[PDB]
C-alpha cells in the first residue's frame, strides 16, 4: 500500500504547498531597486545584522515576520522579540495601516505564549505582557479573527472557559473552516472532561488538515485511552511519530505507558511478561538517551527501581522531581507516595502516613495514596479511624471500582460483626469486579463470606466454602475440610461428611 | 504486595494530566500559515481540493464512529422528464 509518512501528504498537496512552505532561504529586495539578497537560515543568522539590513532596505513586513517565525523554530525567542520590536521601529510598519501593527502585536502575544510554554514559569508576567499586546492589537484592528483566537486562548489559560467558548462560537458563525478554533474548542472541552465532543472535533480537524500543528492524533489517542480502545491509540501515535519524527518525545512517552499497561493487563504467562517488560524498559531507555532529565520518565523508572529494592535511588529521583517540578502537584503526590512506600519497608508508619496525607492534599485523584493512608492507619492499630476514613472515601466515591478497598471494608465489618450486611455487599462487589477483570479471587473473601452466612444461610456458606476449596486445590487446610464436614453433617450428608472428615 | 497490585490496576491513569502539552495551540508553529499575510486562507482553501478519499487508508481507519445504501437518495426539487 501507500506509505504513511509526511511525504504522502506532501505528494497529495500541490508543489506550491510542498516546496515554498518549507523554504529555509529568504529573499529580501534592496532599497536600491531590483537588487535582492538571499540569506539561508541553515547558517548562523545574526539577529542584529539581519534587522539592521531589513530596516535599511525597508523590506515588506512579511519578510520580517517570516524571519521571526524561523527564529521561533530555532528557539530564539529573545531574537524573535528583537525582530518584532525593531519591526515596530521600522519605517514600513509606521507608514502602513494599523492592521500590520496589530498583526505584529499579535505575533508578540504568541511570542509571550511560546516563552510561557517553553519555560512553564513566570506565568503572570508573560500573561500580562501578552494581554497588553493583544489589547493593543484589538484596539488597532478589531476586525482580525486572529485577535479573537488570541482572546480565546488567553481566556483558556486563565480558565475563563465560558468566554473562550463564546469567542469560538462567534468564530464558527464567521466561518466553519477555522482549524485553530476547532482545536481550541476541543482543548476546552477536554479540559471540561467532554471527551466525546473533543473527539469529534479532533476527527474533524484531522480530516480538514492531516498536517496541522498541534497534532490532532495525540488528542485522538487520549480519547481512545478514555474509551479503552488503546490499540487504536497506539496505532495513531505510531502514525503521529511517522508524520512528526522530531520534537515529539511525548508521543513516545505515551506509547511506553500504553505498552506498560498492555504488559500489565494482557501477559498470558510469566515469560511473556518478562519479555514485554524488558522491551518496555529498553524502549524507555532509548527514549531516555534523548532527554535524561524528563521528570515523568524518572517517576516511571522509580516504580521499577522500587520493585528492584533500590529505595535509595528512588528517594534521590523523588527529591530531584520535587525540587524541579514542585509546580505540578501530580508529581509531588507521586513522589510522596513513593517515599511513603519506601518508608513502609522501614516501618516508619507515622512518616509514611504523613507522606500519604501530603500526597492526598497535593492530588486528590491518587486513589493509591488514600488506600496506603488507610493501610498506615491499620499499621498504627487505628481501627476506628481507618474505618471512618474508609466510609468517608466510599461515600464520596461510590462509583469508584476499588476492589481492594471493598475487600478491606468487608474484612473490617466482619471483625466488627454488626455490619455483616455491608460486608456481604462489599465482598460480592469485590468478587464481581475480580471476575470482570479476570483476576484470581482471593479465597479469604470466600471464607469471610461463609463465616458471615453461618448465622444467615448454611447453603450459601457451604457453596462459598466449596468454591474456596476448588480455588485452593492442593492448598486446602484442616479448618476448611472440618467446616465442610460439619456443613455436610448438618445437611445430613453422612457420606460426604465422612469423606471430608477422612 | 496488595499496594503493588493496586498500582498495577491503576497503572498511570492520573499521570496523563501533564501529557496534555500537545493540546496547546500556537499560530507560529505552522510553517506555511504565516509566509504571506493571507497564507491562512490559502492553506484553508488548499485542503478543499482534498477530501476523505485523499486521506491515507490507515488514517481513514482511525475515523471510527463513537457505507452508503442504494435506497437512500438525496432529495431534489426540479426532478427530470
Amino acid at each position: 500500500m501507500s506509505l504513511l509518512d509526511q511525504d504522502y501528504y506532501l505528494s497529495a498537496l500541490p508543489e506550491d504547498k510542498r516546496a515554498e512552505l518549507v523554504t529555509l532561504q529568504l529573499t529580501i529586495p534592496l532599497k536600491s531597486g531590483d537588487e535582492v539578497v538571499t540569506i539561508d537560515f541553515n547558517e548562523d543568522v545574526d539577529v542584529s545584522q539581519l534587522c539592521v539590513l531589513l530596516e535599511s532596505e525597508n523590506a515588506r513586513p512579511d519578510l520580517w515576520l517570516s524571519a521571526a517565525k524561523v527564529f521561533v523554530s530555532k528557539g530564539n525567542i529573545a531574537g524573535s522579540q528583537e525582530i518584532i520590536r525593531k519591526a515596530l521601529q521600522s519605517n514600513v510598519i509606521l507608514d502602513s495601516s494599523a492592521s500590520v501593527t496589530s498583526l505584529f502585536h499579535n505575533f508578540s502575544f504568541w511570542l509571550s505564549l511560546m516563552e510561557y510554554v517553553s519555560t512553564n514559569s513566570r506565568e503572570d508576567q508573560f500573561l500580562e505582557y501578552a494581554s497588553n499586546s493583544l489589547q493593543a492589537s484589538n484596539s488597532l484592528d478589531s476586525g482580525l479573527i486572529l485577535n479573537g483566537i488570541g482572546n480565546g486562548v488567553l481566556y483558556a489559560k486563565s480558565r475563563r472557559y465560558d468566554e473562550a467558548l463564546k469567542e469560538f462560537d462567534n468564530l464558527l458563525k464567521k466561518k466553519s473552516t477555522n482549524i485553530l478554533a476547532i482545536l481550541g474548542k476541543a482543548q476546552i472541552l477536554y479540559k471540561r472532561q467532554k471527551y466525546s465532543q473533543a473527539l469529534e472535533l479532533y476527527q474533524k480537524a484531522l480530516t480538514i488538515n492531516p498536517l496541522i500543528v498541534p497534532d490532532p492524533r495525540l488528542g485522538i489517542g487520549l480519547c481512545f485511552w478514555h474509551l479503552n480502545n488503546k490499540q487504536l491509540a497506539e496505532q495513531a501515535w505510531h502514525n503521529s511519530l511517522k508524520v512528526h519524527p522530531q520534537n515529539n518525545l511525548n508521543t513516545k512517552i505515551l506509547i511506553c505507558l500504553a505498552k506498560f499497561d498492555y504488559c500489565f493487563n494482557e501477559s498470558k504467562d510469566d515469560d511473556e511478561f518478562t519479555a514485554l517488560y524488558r522491551e518496555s524498559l529498553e524502549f524507555l531507555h532509548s527514549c531516555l538517551k534523548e532527554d535524561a532529565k524528563h521528570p515523568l520518565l524518572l517517576m516511571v523508572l522509580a516504580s521499577y527501581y522500587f520493585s528492584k529494592e533500590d529505595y535509595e535511588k528512588v528517594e534521590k529521583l523523588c527529591n530531584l522531581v520535587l525540587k524541579e517540578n514542585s509546580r505540578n502537584a501530580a508529581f509531588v503526590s507521586a513522589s510522596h507516595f513513593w517515599l511513603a512506600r519506601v518508608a513502609y519497608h522501614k516501618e516508619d508508619y507515622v512518616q509514611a502516613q504523613k507522606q500519604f496525607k501530603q500526597a492526598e492534599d497535593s492530588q486528590n485523584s491518587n486513589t493509591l495514596a488514600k488506600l496506603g493512608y488507610a493501610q498506615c492507619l491499620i499499621a498504627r492499630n487505628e481501627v476506628g479511624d481507618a474505618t471512618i476514613y474508609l466510609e468517608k472515601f466510599f461515600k464520596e466515591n461510590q462509583d469508584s471500582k476499588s476492589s481492594e478497598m471493598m475487600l478491606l471494608l468487608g474484612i473490617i465489618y466482619s471483625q466488627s460483626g454488626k455490619s455483616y450486611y455491608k460486608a456481604i455487599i462489599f465482598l460480592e462487589k469485590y468478587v464481581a469486579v475480580c471476575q470482570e477483570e479476570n483476576y484470581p479471587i482471593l479465597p479469604e473473601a470466600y471464607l469471610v463470606l461463609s463465616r458471615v452466612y453461618e448465622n444467615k444461610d448454611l447453603n450459601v456458606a457451604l457453596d462459598y466454602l466449596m468454591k474456596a476449596n476448588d480455588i485452593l486445590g492442593d492448598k486446602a487446610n484442616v479448618y476448611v475440610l472440618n467446616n465442610l464436614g460439619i456443613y455436610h453433617f448438618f445437611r445430613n450428608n453422612v457420606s460426604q461428611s465422612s469423606d471430608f472428615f477422612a | 504486595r496488595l499496594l503493588s497490585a493496586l498500582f498495577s490496576k491503576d497503572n498511570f491513569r492520573y499521570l496523563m494530566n501533564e501529557t496534555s502539552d500537545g493540546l496547546d495551540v500556537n499560530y507560529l508553529r505552522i510553517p506555511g500559515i504565516i509566509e504571506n499575510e493571507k497564507s491562512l486562507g490559502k492553506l484553508f482553501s488548499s485542503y478543499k481540493n482534498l477530501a476523505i478519499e485523499n486521506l491515507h487508508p490507515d488514517d481513514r481507519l482511525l475515523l471510527v464512529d463513537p457505507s452508503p445504501v442504494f435506497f437512500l437518495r438525496r432529495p431534489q426539487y426540479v426532478s427530470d422528464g
Binding site: 531507555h285 535511588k313 483476576y439 | -
Partner: peptide, 30 residues
C-alpha cells in the same frame, strides 16, 4: 483455557519478585 493461563505469579502478588528477576542497567544521573 486463556482465563486460567493468565492467572499467574504477578496476578497472585509476585510481581515484585518477577521484576527482581529482570536485570537491566540504566544511564542514571543519580
Amino acid at each position: 483455557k486463556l482465563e486460567s493461563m493468565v492467572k499467574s505469579n504477578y496476578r497472585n502478588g509476585g510481581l515484585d519478585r518477577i521484576i527482581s528477576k529482570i536485570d537491566f542497567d540504566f544511564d542514571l544521573e543519580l
